[PDB]
Design an enzyme around this catalytic site. Structure first.
Site, short mmCIF file in Angstrom:
data_model
loop_
_atom_site.label_atom_id
_atom_site.label_comp_id
_atom_site.label_asym_id
_atom_site.label_seq_id
_atom_site.Cartn_x
_atom_site.Cartn_y
_atom_site.Cartn_z
N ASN A 1 0.90 -1.04 -0.07
CA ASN A 1 0.00 0.07 0.12
C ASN A 1 0.85 1.16 -0.16
O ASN A 1 1.50 1.59 0.91
CB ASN A 1 -0.76 -0.10 1.25
CG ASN A 1 -2.04 0.97 1.14
OD1 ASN A 1 -1.88 2.06 0.68
ND2 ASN A 1 -3.17 0.87 1.73
N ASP B 1 -0.25 11.24 3.00
CA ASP B 1 -1.24 12.15 3.31
C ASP B 1 -0.54 13.70 3.54
O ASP B 1 0.00 13.91 4.20
CB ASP B 1 -1.86 11.75 4.64
CG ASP B 1 -2.85 10.62 4.57
OD1 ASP B 1 -2.32 9.48 4.03
OD2 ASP B 1 -4.14 10.56 4.79
N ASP C 1 -11.80 1.52 -4.71
CA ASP C 1 -10.58 1.48 -3.99
C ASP C 1 -10.14 0.02 -3.78
O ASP C 1 -9.40 -0.28 -2.87
CB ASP C 1 -10.53 2.26 -3.01
CG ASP C 1 -9.33 2.81 -2.39
OD1 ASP C 1 -8.58 3.13 -3.38
OD2 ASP C 1 -8.84 2.48 -1.34
N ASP D 1 -6.46 -2.32 -6.80
CA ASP D 1 -5.14 -2.55 -6.61
C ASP D 1 -4.67 -3.72 -5.72
O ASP D 1 -3.56 -3.95 -5.55
CB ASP D 1 -4.59 -1.13 -5.77
CG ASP D 1 -4.97 0.10 -6.88
OD1 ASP D 1 -5.93 0.30 -7.17
OD2 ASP D 1 -3.77 0.67 -7.07
N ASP E 1 16.52 16.13 -7.91
CA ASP E 1 17.17 14.77 -8.08
C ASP E 1 17.41 14.20 -6.77
O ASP E 1 18.59 13.64 -6.62
CB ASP E 1 18.39 15.03 -9.00
CG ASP E 1 18.15 16.18 -9.94
OD1 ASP E 1 18.04 17.08 -9.84
OD2 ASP E 1 18.55 15.58 -11.25
N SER F 1 13.81 10.53 0.07
CA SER F 1 14.45 10.51 1.43
C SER F 1 14.33 11.90 2.28
O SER F 1 13.15 12.24 2.51
CB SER F 1 15.85 10.05 1.70
OG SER F 1 16.00 8.62 1.32
N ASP G 1 -1.75 9.05 -9.42
CA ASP G 1 -1.72 7.70 -8.97
C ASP G 1 -0.16 7.15 -8.92
O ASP G 1 0.29 6.24 -9.50
CB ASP G 1 -2.50 6.68 -10.07
CG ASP G 1 -3.85 7.13 -10.14
OD1 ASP G 1 -4.67 7.21 -9.11
OD2 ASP G 1 -4.24 7.29 -11.23
N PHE H 1 20.19 9.37 -4.24
CA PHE H 1 19.61 8.45 -5.14
C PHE H 1 20.22 8.90 -6.63
O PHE H 1 20.10 8.28 -7.52
CB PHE H 1 18.02 8.78 -5.25
CG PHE H 1 17.52 7.88 -4.39
CD1 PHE H 1 16.61 7.10 -4.61
CD2 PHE H 1 17.31 8.31 -3.08
CE1 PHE H 1 16.00 6.17 -3.69
CE2 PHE H 1 16.68 7.86 -1.95
CZ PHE H 1 16.12 6.51 -2.27
N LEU I 1 22.46 6.10 -7.69
CA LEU I 1 21.57 5.09 -7.92
C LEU I 1 21.33 5.07 -9.47
O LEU I 1 20.61 5.94 -9.90
CB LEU I 1 20.43 5.05 -7.18
CG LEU I 1 19.67 3.71 -6.90
CD1 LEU I 1 20.81 2.96 -6.03
CD2 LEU I 1 18.44 3.91 -6.17
N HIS J 1 28.81 10.31 -7.52
CA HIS J 1 27.51 9.71 -8.34
C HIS J 1 28.40 8.77 -9.28
O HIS J 1 29.23 9.16 -9.90
CB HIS J 1 26.77 10.61 -8.71
CG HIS J 1 26.11 11.41 -7.73
ND1 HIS J 1 25.18 12.39 -7.82
CD2 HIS J 1 26.24 11.54 -6.19
CE1 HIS J 1 24.88 13.16 -7.09
NE2 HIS J 1 25.47 12.63 -5.88
N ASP K 1 26.99 8.40 -12.01
CA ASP K 1 26.47 9.00 -13.25
C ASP K 1 27.58 9.79 -13.64
O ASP K 1 27.47 10.21 -14.77
CB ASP K 1 25.28 9.45 -12.87
CG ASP K 1 24.45 9.96 -14.29
OD1 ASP K 1 23.40 10.65 -13.85
OD2 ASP K 1 24.83 9.39 -15.28
N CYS L 1 19.61 21.25 -13.03
CA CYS L 1 19.38 20.33 -13.83
C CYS L 1 18.38 19.19 -13.07
O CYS L 1 18.62 18.14 -13.41
CB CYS L 1 20.38 19.32 -14.48
SG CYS L 1 20.23 18.20 -15.80
#
Lengths: 559, 559
Positions: free
Chosen positions: A128, A132, A137, A140, A288, A308, A309, A321, A324, A385, A387, A541
């Protein structure tokens, strides 16, 4: 299959419930013999036989649900060496109790263990993901159905209880579909009595997971149904039969640049929105610090964001991330990795000044296990990173992609080839002449050190990703060691590009302008265009890229 | 194997370290060609060839440790269509760096992953079990040796660092053997610089584990050695080579009644010390709140006690070790269970009033995994220990043992057979006549309910333990439902016996004395004696039994 133990005696008669499908064992000697029973009861024994030997095996199995208590009987004829045969009676009541779910992963509901692969078995659950009731419903959630066929007066003496182990109750929620819906199993209660009518019936349950697999949650949740006998008001209830289903919580899956881009998100310049167009992919405007992934279930796949529909998660600079990534599907020495392999970097060994990605993050990615993470070496870069030194792009020939590794070497060669041609006077961007860059011994060693760090990764990626030199493309790119001798891009890092399908949004290296054209920019296109990539240089960016989830169902993998 | 990347150029010459055993990759095109090298260097290439094509593969591998820097060289001859051949130089230095341990489990020290079974690989570690240096205290630890062969002046430009991931540092301790001993890797520090001399040398390390496998510790600990280059005072250190070993922390293993008793322990009557004698097993005098197990390593096995030269552990009434047992080695539908299968009981499903064994305990036993725990049903008994309904004894024929399950039925039959014989007047132990026990309908249903609970377990044990009726012996034993309708022994529970090898110490059922002999006592012997068991009835019991560990090395199993 498996089942219970019935003891008959010439003394009196016995009554008993037999669930269709189960193997009911019968004890005859504990009083030559004979077995005669109702048409609906199949009684097969193995050394039908007459010898009154305890080593003899007798099994009953109802054919159909009795219309009323005691419809079928079984009489045991006790006899032998000149004695008038005594008779042992046994009345059976057959009931059909099946707890069903989508074990075939086909999206349709039709011992008990979860098994991976295309030939495996086991229903799947989504977690789930909300920040909030009715169908409005519950689409899913996964459907679980209890089906019963019992004599009208059957639940006056027997009751059904649905349960989960206490160790899994805080990880699942179960709703009963009253043909509204109310919670019947959850973090609050492990068991629940069902209100079930005699005869033919079947109720619907809707299940959802409340936690992704993790260090302390292998990921399986078992739901068990129990058939209790409560015919003796004095004695406590006796379990007469149990059956269950085992759901596995869907992992969080990352999506590689090789996947078709579905939508790009931008914060608060219009080079991206122009590139998004040629891409044939939506564009919307608001960081990012998060990664868009996806959870997938036969009945539905829903995009989930990790930060950190949309669904969200929050577990937890190498700790970003931005450190990542994920490899394209690849096969390594026979083992298959259909959903790619998560790539994240850190240091070669732990030091006083070594950075790494929070262990909670690492532990969590491996726990999803379907993209077996691979640790790379990025700690040498100021930011850190992965990347900053690699990138993946779609390909039409080799394995369907190409690994792009930054290459200081490819840049020295290019600038050198330029000098030989008489352009040593060319300006980069203090502006510097392509002649000084080359003659600069210090810059040279700095890059020579970075070359060492990247090659180390080249090798790592060749092993863990089953790559071959023919899968790699070195991009000209220089570096400089600034603070704490950490590395930074000498000029805009072209390997840190926005791969929008087959239209690349590469950072602009304002390099040596030779013949009206930046030699780097020119060099990059001579490497990618023959691959179909349409290169375009932006003047960096905050941008994420929700990409199409894999066609290969993660549960068909074999981790 | 695997290795690094060397780039040569006609420009200048290159220098490089090559570790013996590793596969060193060479890049030639990034400047027809020719390869000529020193005798000690084996250079093999695959489409030796002359075509200057990047798709060509060139690999070097030193034969022997160079006596000095640059002993071996490799020259690349660049030439072609009418041009005087240019030459590319490359000086290699071969060093031998091997981090060794007892990977063959043979007790002798001689990619990197731990594998189970007799054909597997991987060193083993024991956990430090002490409550409140030299060979005097390192025999229990596992030896790890670093061997090197390098040019005398080699460690002026290179240094070796030993490390563990930060996620495993609190689970291991490493001592350096200075030929005293000091900590070099541990909960405090993940890495450490080694003081290693050039030439031929090898230092000794002693390792110990500080935690058993558990919910959050799969059980593997990896120790890595790194070869750092520090020849450029300016640039930071560059990793040049890494290798490692993977130890697995020895599980805590339980010992079944079928194992030869080695020693019995008693608290603060002399029936046990008399029985201990016939047993041929030591006896010592000072509680049933702990369980004596054992940890095993090629170099040593040490008895470890579990509670809530002995080792101890403290993880954590079904919540008692009195509710902990282990099956004899058994095979189930092909799968092998050499060390038995841990048996512990609880309830059929979770309730408001259901008791269970603390989840931490359960989680811990499964984490040892080598005795895959099996949950039984004991919650019906007032106390709730599985020992109240079952027991194992040694056997000389079937599978080498027999499962003893309490049987109210076996007792009704016996007492009944007694009545028929005219002894319905016999007194049990208020004393009660064997006539009243039978005529007592309430007692009958009570036992009929217990029969249900035990049979349920019979079935469970037949499935999970691959048992056959021919493996089971029902012992006459009655029960009564007292508080909360929970069960208690109607008379001393004979199935709750002290199995000291083949000499059983059964509780005394002061039953119906027929012909000067208690009929129960008599019935029990007629079932076991034909098996070799020497039965003796005590008048009940704080007693534990350290038993001989299995010959089968747990790491030869295949969980």
């Amino acid at each position: 299959a498996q089942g219970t133990l019935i003891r008959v005696t010439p003394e009196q008669p016995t009554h008993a419930v037999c669930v269709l499908g189960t193997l009911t064992q019968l004890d005859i000697c504990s009083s030559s013999f004979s077995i005669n029973a109702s048409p609906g009861v199949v009684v097969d024994i193995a050394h039908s036989t007459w010898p009154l030997d305890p080593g003899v095996e007798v099994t009953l199995t109802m054919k159909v649900a009795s219309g009323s208590t005691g419809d079928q009987k079984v009489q045991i004829s006790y006899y032998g060496p000149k004695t008038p045969p005594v008779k042992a009676l046994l009345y059976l009541t057959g009931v059909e109790i099946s707890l069903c779910a989508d074990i075939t992963r086909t999206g349709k509901v039709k011992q008990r263990t979860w098994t991976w692969g295309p030939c495996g078995q086991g229903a799947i659950l989504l977690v789930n993901c909300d920040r909030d009731l009715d169908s409005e419903d519950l689409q899913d959630m996964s459907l679980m159905t209890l089906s019963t066929k019992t004599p009208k007066d059957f639940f006056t003496n027997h009751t059904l209880v649905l349960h989960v182990a206490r160790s899994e109750m805080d990880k699942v929620r179960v709703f009963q579909a009253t043909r509204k819906c109310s919670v019947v199993l959850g973090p609050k209660w492990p068991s629940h009595y069902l209100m079930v009518p005699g005869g033919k019936h079947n109720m619907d349950f809707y299940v959802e997971a409340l936690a992704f697999p993790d260090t302390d949650f292998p990921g399986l949740i078992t739901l068990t149904i129990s058939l209790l006998d409560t015919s003796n008001l004095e004695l406590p209830e006796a379990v007469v039969f149990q059956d269950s289903v085992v759901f596995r919580v869907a992992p969080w899956i990352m999506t590689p640049n090789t996947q078709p881009p579905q939508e790009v998100y931008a914060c608060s310049l219009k080079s991206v929105t122009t590139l998004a167009m040629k891409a044939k992919c939506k564009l919307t405007i608001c960081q990012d610090e998060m990664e868009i992934g996806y959870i997938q279930a036969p009945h539905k796949t829903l995009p989930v964001v990790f930060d950190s529909d949309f669904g969200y998660v929050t577990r937890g600079g190498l700790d970003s991330f931005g450190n990542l990534e994920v490899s394209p599907p690849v096969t390594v020495r026979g083992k298959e990795y259909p959903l790619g392999r998560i790539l994240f970097g850190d240091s070669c060994y732990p030091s006083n000044d070594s950075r790494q990605m929070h262990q909670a993050l690492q532990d969590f990615l491996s726990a999803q296990q379907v993209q077996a993470p691979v640790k790379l070496y990025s700690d040498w870069l100021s930011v850190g990173h992965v990347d900053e030194f690699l990138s993946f792009v779609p390909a039409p020939d080799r394995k369907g992609f190409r690994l792009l590794l930054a290459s200081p070497r490819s840049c020295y060669k290019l600038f050198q080839e330029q000098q030989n041609e008489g352009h040593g006077e060319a300006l980069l961007f203090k502006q510097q002449k392509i002649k000084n860059i080359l003659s600069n011994k210090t810059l040279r060693e700095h890059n020579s050190f970075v070359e060492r760090c990247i090659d180390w990764n080249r090798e790592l990626l060749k092993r863990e990703l089953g790559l071959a030199e023919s899968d790699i493309i070195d991009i000209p790119q220089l570096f400089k060691l600034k603070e704490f001798s950490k590395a930074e891009a000498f000029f805009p890092n072209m390997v840190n590009m926005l791969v929008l399908g087959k239209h690349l949004g590469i950072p602009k290296p304002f390099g040596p302008v030779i013949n009206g054209r930046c030699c780097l920019e020119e060099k990059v296109c001579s490497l990618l265009e023959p691959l179909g990539l349409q290169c375009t240089f932006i003047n960096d960016c905050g941008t994420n890229v929700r990409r199409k989830p894999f066609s290969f169902k993660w549960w068909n993998m074999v981790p």
